């Protein structure tokens, strides 16, 4: 109806420090001598830090005339997910991701009398694939009353600008929530323990810290760089390589202005991409030992379904209803190279991974299970071979090697065990593989 | 013939450190007070890792429809040679080189 | 039958030769280090002593 | 030829190396490769033309069995690895080694 | 009928040190009938007064409050009728059917 | 959202009447030599209802 306010004041909320009007005034040339020159200083002290609620100001030439506002100013600030770039494509039917790599082989020597009689041989490529589902669904919702909103504006393109504004502050909190979720990803991963560890201490116990990080982190961004490739840098234990260029490394600002204060090395090397890849700068990581992330650009699997915007009208409240609805998958890639940098207090063996996930067998076959162990220190440990299937027949040796019985059916689980702890208080790392049983 | 695995789990081969899950649920502001108002958090940290064994997911609407796949891609890795550079030209006659 | 696209089935098959093709350039790299260290092993290099 | 460990440890641990970062006329090109199975070998610093490198056959066979109905794939690669001893080579060695 | 064929092909083979032919002619396809189209036995033996019990939804989910209603159909070899058991084996307490 | 089913199997509303799959391969000149020979007999029993 007609909201109003009376005797409000322009301090309000503010918070006097030294009352500068009377610093200038009381001023015998200590520091304020600069301002004293100034004429009609009080006049901007007064108001010179805005005034949030105006009221009527009199003309000073003709009492009875009101001061008019003469500018209108919307602030147009455009909020953007730094992790935007990871973004895929869109997916407009089917919901389920299937990624498919295939990893190398042996050699064999050349032997023409050997290949006499094993012409025909067969051999088996290494296929292994990963599978990804739409995980994120959500939607925002606003009112515009633009009936009610054309008196405070006086022109249409100010009033377009204004529903403009309340639409770009939509896409603005959409793009945060995107960010929010990709990073949870990192925090998720972390807590699901699938990285690669990398043990340090903590970097602001003293200065040689902060430079033993920076050598590891170079060393493993120089490591996974590598042309030819290592088996030891991702989940799915394959080997792969990255680009230098396409090397990201997630820290948070902090620690990011620490060491590029305190190294001489980075700070030469700054805004500087073949000197550990991109740098991407973030608030945090909320995790107790999470430093910084090095990942690959083809880690993140980030794919959308549905970005669309509906709106429907209220006539009897003259107002109209939007609403934005997003859908996207939100996954990550175990193929990639992955590394953390934890320095806190980190298990001897991070996991262990069976190399074939999935298999099938006949009732007469073998099979060979070889054991990657992600152990953050330089000693090795010895793993332990069982499988639970049950039957009896069924066994599998020391080495890797399980050969299954001439009749059963079960399925068979192959779990290859790793102890850490110490005597009497046994702690066991277990990967696990799934083995199935043809009816031959 | 007919390969199928079934009572396949989302946490075949991974090792737990601290239950995200749990600690957006029970964070005071600590640390997770930035995923806490972040909706469909848990969907995410469920299947955000990767899933090994996939298996037939029906549709929400109609459940006796099933959900296919929208997108298969084929990793295209390809490894070089460092000291590739150092390579001379062929020789399809003879074996023997003498340099003098 | 693990695809419908010809385009994908063609994708996997070159994916395979690529796959080849990688092994055969490790096996390379592998043989020109192991140049080195023979040369090495039959001490043919100018030794700095650190 | 260096490793990556030690050439880590030199940029950060030297100034000059730091500031000569890819750089071509300080030390010549770099390359980086995972260790050389080694006790005393740290670095080797080759020539261009101490590589003898050739290749004499690089060529692929395929056959088709029908009883089984597949393809089978042969790469056959034949090549000449040598090294020359008229160009310059110094191995930087970090043990103890001969007199002479 | 939903019967359909994946593959016909013939594959020829030859063997110059016996001096012979091998031919393989395979055949792949699918073969199943459609639970949608009426059908019906004309069986002249012994036959049991029920044959069989199907019910209308026979892939459902449920919220953890909700609630479903089933609907069973007896294929009967005569006019007498039959009364239907409802049982749930979830083991869960708390959950159960009525009669109906 | 994520609806899955976990242990089921094909005999969900099926009541066998004679048992074809054994009753074919236990059968001596009666009238189920005919499919004696078929290879693929059990596999195409297996799933041919649906």
Do not use: C
Not at 62 to 79: A, E, F, K, W, Y
Request: hydrophobic letters at 40%.
């Amino acid at each position: 109806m007609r909201i109003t306010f009376n005797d409000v004041k322009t301090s309000l909320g503010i918070t006097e420090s030294y009352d500068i009007v009377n610093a200038i005034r009381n001023s015998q040339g200590d520091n304020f001598k600069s301002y004293v020159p100034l004429a009609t200083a009080n006049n901007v002290a007064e108001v010179g830090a805005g005034i949030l609620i105006n009221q009527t100001v009199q003309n000073d030439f003709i009492t009875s005339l009101v001061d008019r506002i003469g500018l209108v100013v919307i602030r147009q600030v455009s909020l953007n997910n730094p992790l935007k770039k990871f973004k895929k494509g869109q997916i407009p039917l089917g919901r389920t991701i299937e990624e498919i790599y295939t990893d190398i082989t042996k050699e064999k020597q050349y032997d023409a009398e050997e290949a006499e009689q094993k012409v025909f041989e067969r051999e088996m490529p290494n296929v292994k694939t990963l599978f990804h589902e739409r995980n994120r669904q959500g939607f925002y919702h606003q009112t515009i009353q633009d009936d009610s909103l054309k008196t405070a504006f006086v022109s249409w393109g100010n009033f377009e600008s204004f529903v403009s504004s309340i639409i770009n502050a939509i896409y603005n909190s959409a793009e945060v929530d995107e960010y929010e979720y990709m990073k949870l990803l990192v925090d998720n991963y972390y807590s699901k323990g699938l990285f690669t560890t990398v043990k340090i201490d903590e970097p602001t116990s003293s200065t040689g810290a902060l430079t033993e990080f920076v050598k590891k982190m170079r060393a493993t961004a120089r490591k996974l760089t590598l042309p030819q490739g290592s088996r030891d840098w991702n989940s799915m234990a394959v080997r792969t390589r990255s680009y230098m260029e396409d090397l990201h490394l997630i820290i948070d600002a902090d620690l990011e202005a620490e060491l590029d204060v305190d190294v001489l090395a980075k700070a030469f090397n700054m805004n500087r991409t073949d000197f550990l890849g991109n740098v991407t700068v973030i608030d945090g990581f909320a995790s107790t030992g999470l430093e910084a992330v090095l990942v690959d650009k083809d880690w993140f699997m980030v794919y959308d379904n549905l970005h669309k915007m509906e709106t429907v009208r209220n006539p009897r409240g003259l107002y109209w209803n939007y609403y934005y609805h997003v859908w996207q998958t939100l996954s990550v890639s175990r193929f990639a190279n992955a590394v953390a940098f934890v320095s806190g207090d980190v298990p001897a063996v991070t996991q262990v991974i069976v190399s074939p996930n999935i298999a099938a067998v006949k009732q007469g076959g073998q099979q060979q299970f070889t054991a990657y162990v992600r152990a953050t220190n330089a000693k090795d440990h010895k793993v332990v071979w069982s499988v639970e299937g049950g039957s009896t027949g069924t066994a599998i040796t020391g080495d890797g090697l399980l050969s299954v019985s001439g009749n059963e059916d079960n399925q068979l689980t192959v779990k290859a065990t790793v102890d850490i702890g110490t005597e009497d208080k046994p702690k066991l790392v277990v990967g696990e593989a799934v083995v199935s049983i043809r009816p031959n």
